[PDB]
Amino acid sequence: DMALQHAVDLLEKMLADEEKKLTPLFEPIKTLEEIIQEGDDVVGAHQLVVTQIKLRVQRNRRLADEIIREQLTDIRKVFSDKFEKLEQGIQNSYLLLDKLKTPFQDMRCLFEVANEQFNDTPVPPQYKEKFMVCLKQIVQYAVNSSSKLEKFVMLKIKTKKDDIKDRVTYTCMKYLLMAMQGTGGPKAINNEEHAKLFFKQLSNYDDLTDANHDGLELIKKLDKEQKEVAFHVNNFTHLVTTLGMALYKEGHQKNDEAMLGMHTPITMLSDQVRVLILYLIDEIVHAIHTNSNQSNDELIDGLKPKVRIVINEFHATLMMGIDKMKFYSLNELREIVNDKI
Amino acid sequence: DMALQHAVDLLEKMLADEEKKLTEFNLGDPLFESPIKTLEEIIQEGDDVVGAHQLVVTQIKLRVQRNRRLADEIIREQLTDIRKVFSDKFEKLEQGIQNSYLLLDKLKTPFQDMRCLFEVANEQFNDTPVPPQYKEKFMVCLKQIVQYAVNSSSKLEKFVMLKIKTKKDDIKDRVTYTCMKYLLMAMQGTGGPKAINNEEHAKLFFKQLSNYDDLTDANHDGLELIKKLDKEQKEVAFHVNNFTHLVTTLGMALYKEGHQKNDEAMLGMHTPITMLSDQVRVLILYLIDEIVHAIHTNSNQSNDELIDGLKPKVRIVINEFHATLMMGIDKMKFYSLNELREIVNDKIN
Incomplete structure (x- = not known):
């Protein structure tokens, strides 16, 4: 089936893992100035701001969710496309590698090399026929004797097919992780902690006028946090697409x-x-x-x-697979055959 | 000085090794190198068959030597093409590394002397709501406990500064390597095999001059070989550019990977x-x-x-x-306040 499947799976799992980590029986957010005017009296103003704070933390929480959800989907789309594209390249390289093996399929390149080499080898016409007969048969022998080589080639080909599937799945998963740790955000929120702290010591004020001043200030930052949202999602839509571009390029x-x-x-x-x-x-x-x-x-x-x-x-030479190309000269082959007979 | 210098070294080295492989006596060579005519002109001058044989036999024996000389010279234009392409692509990658060095240094500045603790403390103090009777006690204890926390954090600061240098080094190693990997590719792609078709043919022609019953037959073969030596030679400029393409292709592929x-x-x-x-x-x-x-x-x-x-x-x-920071770069998590509280009460037992 699909070569990079392991990555597509992990992609779908990790998105699933994140999606569930995300989270009206009876009878409204008010702008800051709407809060001040309804807030004639200190006690009313105070009851108004304690709920507005507690309300805005709820909105701010659900909005945190709504950006993760849009991140989780943006990520599925970006990472699926690059997954699909990397898949064609692998599939295509599979074909290219196979196209590469065909000369050495039944080592038939030998007949062709023999063929082309015969015509350009000069031999006196009286002896040319013996030459042809001996060459055919000795090349034909070499063909039949060459499976050790052919199988070498096919395996070095199979190895390279697999080396690609593994290495691309690896870089696939890697850029996935990178994209995944960058999802959502921090655990401890400033305002939620300011709010928690406000409420922890709301009974230690003495003058309710002071509490009201703090609660309003906390509200202003809950509002600043909220419109600062559009900043935070595009800062990410960017980060994910570069990770996408980086996934592709490496892969x-x-x-x-x-x-x-x-x-x-x-x-x-x-x-x-x-x-x-x-x-x-x-x-x-x-x-x-x-x-x-x-x-x-x-x-x-x-x-x-x-x-x-x-x-x-x-x-023997190929099993060493010396990273440097080794070339044979007619005579090197001639002295190497004279010694080991 | 230069970051990729080892690569610029190795390039400078490998070009010289190849230039010297041309200076040094390549085994079966003429002790001395001591006048060439086209095929149509060689037959014309023949007049006499025995004269004609001596001419084409000497011409092949000469042309193979010209081809040896043309071979050494195509490598030389390739060696310069490699210097031109790679020394350039190297410096571009160098310009690239140096820019990331700057980016990485700018990243350290917040944690320099952990000055960021003072900045966050500044901003978090300003936004923490506290009943005015306690606002000075709060301020006072905050001021000092942050100042202590800064003093107690050289442990983080040196480490952070370290992981950053490491990234500087990591960049150099990975690009140096990518430079070297592409260096070898272009370096192996030079010249050609040890066994030359025509060169081995001439040898076989000459090995059999003593069995050519009829010299019009010897001459007919020797002429055919003449043709092959000329075909090899007219395709010379074609294959050197076959490299100039190959090397500039290797240049772009070098840049992109680095x-x-x-x-x-x-x-x-x-x-x-x-x-x-x-x-x-x-x-x-x-x-x-x-x-x-x-x-x-x-x-x-x-x-x-x-x-x-x-x-x-x-x-x-x-x-x-x-501790978490030593665990590894991708094992970093986000902390919550309460997590910190259980990490602290348990560790007083």
């Missing part, structure tokens, strides 16, 4: 990061293929002249061990 | 800093609350007795802030 290139990681094995092997051909043609041409005695079938059966040694050496 | 390992460290900073500056605020509110509770629970105790009473609690709170 979209952890992706291309495995594809650029594929270059040296493929190109190093495909050169090793070419050099093998150049070796065989050389050893075949050499054999036609250093020995007029042998039948061609004897030649072919004779190279078979030499072919196995190089292939087995190519496979 | 610039975002950078932007990423700055976003790794955004919330944690706000969470500490939050702990600062809560600590203030906690003290204010504790002072107010204390003012009403005991009328006998002096101001100094009250303040001295709070001193241990402030230490407990800061030390709890610091």
